[PDB]
Design a protein around this ligand. Structure first.
Ligand SMILES: C=CC(=O)Nc1cc(Nc2nccc(-c3cn(C)c4ccccc34)n2)c(OC)cc1N(C)CCN(C)C
Length: 310
């Protein structure tokens, strides 16, 4: 069939980590900024802790399953889970937040080199997920986090599906889905593949190149499947040369097999990242620059999760 998934699921002691401040609260629960100090190791690891219904527990454990099974510099990984009266996911702290919020807040100091590098990094992350036979199903700028302005990672595996041994697609049930990011065949037939992820990657790039605009703003999601069928697509962002826009457009072909592969998106955006001002036209580009967080003073032993292995 397929290879055995030998990922380790680490179970953490609640006394080993300290919540410092709330980062966000919603129906997903409450995310805290915090520190994880595994007993006896003399490391302090900055973490986000997602604290949390018996079906809502089955949902967060599926996410933990997926996150524990990935290991790539451009994908967020799970440090572990804690099974208290509520279930908590402990993941790497990504101090600059979501890329969608980052491009909105810093539109005036984001140059072409950052934008094209992020495109490369997300393609690398998605290519890795495809190698792992994983379909994300919710790729979007809100679901990419910023570790540093130079380093982003794909996150939010709440919808992700490992495709079975001989499965090329996944057929979902019904529910609330992110219509404005989805391939046409996913909207119409609830079918999802690596190539429908390519479609959402195209939409994600469009979000970045417009510094966080909302795709198909105002148009109700009811009408999206019809608009796409007529052959309409998102418009060329002002900063985009035709080279970059043609890549996005190719991600939105009706024939899924004629969309680019993630490994080709890596190559094409890497070429453009070598001469970024040739491919994105940003006023003031050549002079832009981008870069306590825990209210604790003795951070001598702090270690990023990426340097904390086994
Ligand atoms: C959309 C809001 C957002 O991303 N906020 C955010 C996030 C982090 N870091 C972080 N690192 C890893 C995971 C998460 C995270 C995961 N989930 C599910 C979240 C839900 C809401 C907010 C944050 C998260 N968050 C963070 O680390 C210091 C700070 C912030 N904000 C307070 C700063 C960004 N703000 C301008 C929106």
């Amino acid at each position: 069939g397929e290879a055995p998934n030998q990922a380790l699921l680490r179970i953490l002691k609640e006394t080993e980590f300290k919540k410092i401040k709330v980062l966000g609260s919603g129906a997903f629960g409450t995310v805290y900024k915090g520190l994880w100090i595994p007993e006896g190791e003399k490391v302090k690891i900055p973490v986000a802790i997602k604290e949390l219904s018996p079906k809502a527990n089955k949902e967060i454990l599926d996410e933990a399953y997926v996150m524990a099974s990935v290991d790539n510099p451009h994908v967020c990984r799970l440090l572990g889970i804690c099974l208290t009266s509520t279930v908590q996911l402990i993941m790497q702290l990504m101090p600059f937040g979501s890329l969608l919020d980052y491009v909105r807040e810093h539109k005036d100091n984001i140059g072409s080199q950052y934008l094209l590098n992020w495109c490369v990094q997300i393609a690398k992350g998605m290519n890795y997920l495809e190698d792992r036979r994983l379909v994300h199903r919710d790729l979007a700028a809100r679901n990419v986090l910023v570790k540093t302005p130079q380093h982003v990672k794909i996150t939010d595996f709440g919808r992700a599906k490992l495709l079975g041994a001989a499965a090329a697609e996944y057929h979902a049930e019904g529910g609330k889905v992110p219509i404005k990011w989805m391939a046409l065949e996913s909207i119409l037939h609830r079918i999802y593949t690596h190539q429908s992820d390519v479609w959402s990657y195209g939409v994600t790039v469009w979000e970045l190149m417009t510094f966080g605009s909302k795709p198909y703003d105002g148009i109700p999601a009811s009408e999206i499947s019809s608009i796409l069928e007529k052959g309409e697509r998102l418009p060329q962002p002002p900063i985009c040369t035709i080279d970059v826009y043609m890549i996005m457009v190719k991600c939105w072909m009706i024939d899924a097999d004629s969309r680019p592969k993630f490994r080709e998106l890596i190559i094409e955006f890497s070429k453009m990242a070598r001469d970024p001002q040739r491919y994105l036209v940003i006023q003031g580009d050549e002079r832009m620059h981008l870069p306590a967080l825990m209210d604790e003073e003795d951070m001598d032993d702090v270690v990023d999760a990426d340097e904390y292995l086994i």
